[PDB]
Every structure is written in structure tokens, then in C-alpha cells.
Amino acid sequence: KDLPIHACSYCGIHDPACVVYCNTSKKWFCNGRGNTSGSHIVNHLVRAKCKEVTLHKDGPLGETVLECYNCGCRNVFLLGFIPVVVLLCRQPCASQSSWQPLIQDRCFLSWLVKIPSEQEQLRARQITAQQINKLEELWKENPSATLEDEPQHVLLRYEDAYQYQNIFGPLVKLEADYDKKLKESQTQDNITVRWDLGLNKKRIAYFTLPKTDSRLMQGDEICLRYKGDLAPLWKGIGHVIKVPDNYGDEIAIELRSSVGAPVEVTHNFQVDFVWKSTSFDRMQSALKTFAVDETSVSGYIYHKLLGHEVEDVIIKCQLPKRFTAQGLPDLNHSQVYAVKTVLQRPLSLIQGPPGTGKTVTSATIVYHLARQGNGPVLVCAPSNIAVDQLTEKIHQTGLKVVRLCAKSREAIDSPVSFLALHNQIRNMDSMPELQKLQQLKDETGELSSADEKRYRALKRTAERELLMNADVICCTCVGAGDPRLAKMQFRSILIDESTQATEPECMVPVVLGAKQLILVGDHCQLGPVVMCKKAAKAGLSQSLFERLVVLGIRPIRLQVQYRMHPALSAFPSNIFYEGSLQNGVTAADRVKKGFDFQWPQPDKPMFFYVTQGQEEIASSGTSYLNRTEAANVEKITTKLLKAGAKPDQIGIITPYEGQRSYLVQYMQFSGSLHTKLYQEVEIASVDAFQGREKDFIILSCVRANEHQGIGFLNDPRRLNVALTRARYGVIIVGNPKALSKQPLWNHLLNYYKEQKVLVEGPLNNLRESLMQF
Ligand SMILES: [Zn+2]
Ligand SMILES: [Zn+2]
Ligand SMILES: [Zn+2]
């Protein structure tokens, strides 16, 4: 929804008491001066060459054309009051033969047209006098135009949410367009399908694509077309329920509609990846409302987000007697500090380094916010796993939590699916008619118009009730722009993994009425992914959290790590956290009991295992693999399991789909242990381990030739995530020469070598490598 029709055509102000409608130009202007020395009407009347004026319906005087009571002269520069008061022309009507100027000090009398307060004007578009000239110069022959007549780089500080929209807006468009072409380039042509039937009795299609790195996500939408000649032309939409993983390389989709699926036929399918504008629209719209709607975020948040100087404000509030939340672990001192500081200000950042209890700290905050009783607390993060991790912790506190997701993500199971709004509505025994309708619906996918109408009516009632009555609503950043949440307000908002969102993404939940906003994350960890290189270079890949940091806002840092053996945290702490991370567990706490595995350096549970075999490209696709390297990864995996580790306590991180896929196949084929044990060893790229941990982590670097690389190979931040998932042991497998083409990896290899932990030869008889860097 735009500005009201009575919005000042210059700065946006739309308080009916402060506006003046210009009869010739048919436009409204405000009685405030803003950036110039003189009001916005007066400045306009002068340059547009006008004099005739009508006041607003809801104004001190009502909807009336200003004119002299004597002669009806409508010239405002000639009008004025004589003292029980009369409006008269200075000459000759004020002349005693038949005084106060109406315009005085370059604007209208305050008690006929009110002057907007500083706040309103400080919130309006900051239009300069030199900008008025040019804008007013264009209206001359184009009364339609506005101020907008290689993309402009992101800034630290913004005059305006309007300037803000104008800078990020075109960045979002570059991303959306890029993404559309990307998605559309992905079409696969000669595809073989395996058909199946879920227990929910929906139709499922399995198929295998070339091996690619980009990624495909559960709940993504795929258009499956039959194009063979064993039958006729058929098209179906489905949503991804399986990506290639430890159970094999197949992608699986669940069809929306069961009906008419060509189950009998197998060859000649075409796979298209449906693009939707939704997330970009929601981003564009959040920019719009950030500019246009002054109730969408508080004055404080508004000025703070835009890089203005604001005096500190203490949020009034009753502190809990105890900061630790029921259901959750006792907080340490720095976490207690974070919770208490954060509750007492309108805006905060919290930095949660690996192993420091970011998630528990966020859940505890949310918990106290929810008990202050201001309606549902809004909680977001940029990714589905990070929302789910947060949802789960918050649930431990005993609060009513609703997890909201897209209708496309509905087929997806997670540990928190039982909390999903669509599942909760399904269990509403207070609503039998809705339940009956929902049964009917679960035979086809669809309903009759009279019933689909009824069902939508009831489903809306059911969604209002669970959403309005929740203590906490968890959803994705982009998901906060869901139409089911519009018409709701959220005064308290916590965004975790905010360091993974672009500014526009982050702002989507922000504009839903923020009065208190907490951004949690870690800018030394995962950042936003921006596919469009132009957009990237203009700044889009800088999260909101990062910009506020560079702007000089100090994040409260969580200080104690409880995950890692001290030897494992040393290097990331020294590199990313200026050696400030404190160890909450000892070396002794982090020696696995009866785990008889021989570390090269027995008291340092890490090593870099040198291999220098050749990388190759996948036989089907464009990703990389390393066969030498994979054999070694299995041997290590097998040693760890034989020494006492359990498959779910081990993770393998590699940047390439080629290597992931090869590793699963290789272990199933050549692993000496029972095949299923390997199936339970998670192999994936670094994204899938965010917020998660294992006892042991193996990295498989893959590349043996100098390269740009992807994931942890050329992003120090992803390397930081890779090095901090393990509690007990980290093993890196790879080729040092290929990797030392990197300041960081260079430092990592020097470090490991000084630590005597850069090694070669058979696992049974490891020697220190003689290479140097
Ligand atoms: Zn104005
Ligand atoms: Zn005019
Ligand atoms: Zn007159």
C-alpha cells in the first residue's frame, strides 16, 4: 500500500494538519522545511508559479479554498489576518478605506496549517533544495516524474529509507533476474524416472541428474514433463523431498496432484526447475514499506539501521529474577550478560562464535521476551535448518511455538514438523468440519469450488487462532513476508544467523512493527550467497549485521566455547576471534574414553594427512572428485569406527558434489565394515553442518591443482565452520601445494607443521611430511 493521496509530493509527510493542496498542480505539499530554509508548499508555489490553495478535509478549518472574505482573492502571498479574525488582501482590503501575513518566514501560519514535528521530518525523504529545482524543472513538461530520473554501491549511512530502497531495490532486481535465467538454464532432457507411492499415498518420482555444484533444496519446485512416445504429452508439478545423499544419487519429488501420473512409463522425461518471484517480491516490498510506512519500525530502529547518530535509549522492562530459562542449561557469565543487556535496549547484536551456545542464548532471550506479554514473539533465520534448530530449543522452554513454512515445504519432515502450522491445524479437534474437509481433500489433492471455498474460510480461522495465540512464531526471514503474517504486528523480533542474510532479506521480518530487535550471528561464519556477480560487487553480500559492525556497533560476544578440545579451537580462535575464545572444557574432558586410535601427536587430536593424487571431473557432470583421496577418507573412517566411534559421531565435509557422491559409493562398495554403518556417516558440504556438531570431522579437500575452488577452499569463513564442528578430532585430507595458494590455508599448513601434525605414509606408520611453506 502506497502513501496516502495527501502525501507531500516532496518528502512524503502525510499528517492531514500539515498539508496544503495546490489547485493548479493538483498536488499536495507539507508545511515543514526539512532540509531547506522555507516550507515545501512555499518553495513549490514559487517555482511552479502558483497561489491558489485548498486545505484538507480533516484540517483545523475543514476543506476550504483560502480566499479573502472581502473580494475572494485567492493569492496566498497577498492574504493575511486582521484581528474573532478575518482573512483579507493586504491591499486594499486590509486598508482602512474599506495585520498578519498568511505566509510568514517562508511558510504558512502554524495555527492554520500545522508544522510537522522534528521526528516526522527526520523520517521523511531528505530532499535537498538543489533536488527541488531539478524535480520541479521536470514536472514542467512531465508532471508524472519522480526523483529517480552499473548499479550504485551499498553505503554505510543513508539519508533515508527512500535512498535505501533506491540502492538495494535495483540490487534485488539484479539477483532476481540472474536467478531466473540460472534456473531456466538448468533444464535436463533425457531423464529416466522410477515411480513410487508414499505412505501418505502421494505420487513420488525418482530420477538422477548430472553431478553439479551451485544448491537444490527440499521443497524446491520441479516441473516434470513426459515427452516420449509410449504415451501422450503430460506435465506435473512436484516438490523435492530427496536430494542426492547417503542413500544414493536420486532426487525425489512429491507431485502436488496424484491424478494421471504416467506411472507405467519410465524413459524420456524432462525436468525443469520452476522459478518463483516470491522471495524477491517480498524483499522489494519490505524495502517499500521501510520507506513508506512510519509504523513499520520504531523511530529508534529506523535511525539506527540507517547509520544516523541516535542517543541511547533504555527499553523499560522488568528483568527476570533468573536469566536461565526453565528447560534449558544454566547460562555462563557472558551469556547472562548478553541476555540482560539485550532485554534493556531497542537494538542489539550478539556474536556467537562456534561452540559458545548461541542457540541456547537466543532461546533464553526469546523466552523472556515472550513472558513480557506483548503478543507472539517473532523469530527468524535465513535458512530452514537454523530456524528448526532455534524452534527446537525454544520448545524446550515450554512455550507455545508455531513454525511457519511455505505450502511447498509442507511435505518435509524435520524434528520440529510437529510444530509446523499446517500440522497443528490438522490436529484441531475443536474444528471438526475443517477436519472432515481436510480428509476429503486427501484423496485427490483438490476440492469442488463450494468446498474449496468453505475449506479456505475455515483454514483461515484456524490459522488466525494458532498464530494470534502463539507465544512464539518461528519462520524464515523470507517467510516472515507470508500473507498469513501480514495484518499482524511484532514488537519483539530476534533474528539468528542474521549474518547469513542480505540486508533486504533481513528487513522482511523487520518491517512487521519492530520496537525491539536483536540480531544474532557471527560474521566470521557463513555469509549470504549472491549469484549475480554485479550485485555482489555492489555490496549485496554484506549482511545487515556486518554493516552495523563496520558502522561501529559493538556486538556482545559469547565468550566460552564448550565444544572443542583446546588443540582444535586454538587456530580458529587465533585467526578469527583474536585469540579471545575461552575453553570451557579441558583436554581431559575431550579425550574419548577407551577410544584406542593413535594420533600422530597423541595429545593433539588433529592432523593434516597429505595426499597428492590427481583430481578429475565427474563422468556425468562438471563437479570434481579425487579417487586417491576418497580411498584415504574411507580408511580413516574405518579406523575411527573400529577404534570405538559411532557413525553419527563422524562427519565428512567436502565442497564437491563429485566427491560427496563418489565417497558414498566408494564406502558402500569397498568399506570392510557393515555397509549401513557408512550410511550413517554424514557426507556433505559445509552448509549442512551449520549449528551442528560431531565427535570427529574429516575434511576432503579434493583439488590437487591450483584452482579458485568453492566452499571452504576459497572462503575463509567456510573454512572456519569446517574447523569447528568437531569435539574430539579433526582430520584434513588433501594436497598442501594446491592449497597453499591462499594466505589462510597457508597459515593453517604452517601451524599444523609447527604442531608436528602435518603427516604422510600409511596410517599404521605415519611420518612427518618434509614439505615447507
Ligand atoms: Zn514535504
Ligand atoms: Zn501548484
Ligand atoms: Zn481582497
Coordinates of N, CA and C and ligand atoms in Angstrom, one line a residue, residues 68 70-71 73 89 93, ligand 3:
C68 N -9.9 35.8 0.3 CA -10.3 36.9 1.1 C -11.8 37.0 1.2
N70 N -13.5 39.6 1.7 CA -14.0 40.8 1.0 C -14.2 40.5 -0.4
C71 N -13.1 40.1 -1.1 CA -13.1 40.0 -2.6 C -13.0 38.6 -3.2
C73 N -10.1 37.0 -3.4 CA -8.8 36.9 -4.0 C -8.1 35.7 -3.4
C89 N -7.0 40.6 1.8 CA -5.9 41.1 1.0 C -5.2 42.2 1.7
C93 N -8.0 45.6 0.9 CA -8.9 45.0 1.8 C -8.5 45.2 3.3
Ligands
ZN3 ZN -9.4 41.1 -1.1

